[PDB]
Amino acid sequence: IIPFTAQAYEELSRQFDPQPLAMQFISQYSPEDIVTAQIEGSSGALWR
């Protein structure tokens, strides 16, 4: 999990800047707020 930095936050906000409310969400949430969901995908755990 990566706590998004100020620069990272700017990136996300700019990605969704065209849509006002999209950018709003990101921008309103404080920097080091938006966290990165780097969920693991590898298995190993077989299933039962």
Partner: protein, 141 residues
């Protein structure tokens, strides 16, 4: 551990210069009937695994194929923990002065007895019956 990442874990202990996060989370879930807001008192006692250290070289051979390596984890099993009704398994300082070097010498033994049948016994540096029953203490509040 997923096979590609198991081989990567291997590699780390084998060579890969990285520090495996050995978070020894000591979660202490109590109850709420007798009170205890965040009953679960937890603390990840992490041991950054120095790349190919004595412990990690034992782990290299552990994950190579042999199952007879007593991985020396420098005193990292809190034998006295002042846990309260909050979410923290903080050990008592002075009870364990170093409290990272005065916890309790813990050992690890992966028992891959192909028949890999990878088991994992948590031993002690001085395991008497603490390979199956490690006796620490939680100073409860």
């Amino acid at each position: 551990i997923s096979p590609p990442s198991r081989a990567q874990m291997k590699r780390e202990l084998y060579n890969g210069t990285a520090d495996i996060t050995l978070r020894f989370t000591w979660n202490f879930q109590r109850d709420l009937a007798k009170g205890g807001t965040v009953e679960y008192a937890n603390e990840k006692h992490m041991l950054a695994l120095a790349p190919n250290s004595t412990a990690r070289r034992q782990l290299a051979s552990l994950l190579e194929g042999t199952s007879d390596q007593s991985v020396v984890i420098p005193n990292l099993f809190p034998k006295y923990i002042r846990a309260p009704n909050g979410p923290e398994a903080n050990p008592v300082k002075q009870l364990q002065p170093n409290e990272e070097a005065d916890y309790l010498g813990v050992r690890i033994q992966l028992r891959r007895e192909q028949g890999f049948l990878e088991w994992w016994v948590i031993e002690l540096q001085e395991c008497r019956t603490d390979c199956n029953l490690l006796p620490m203490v939680i100073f409860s509040d």
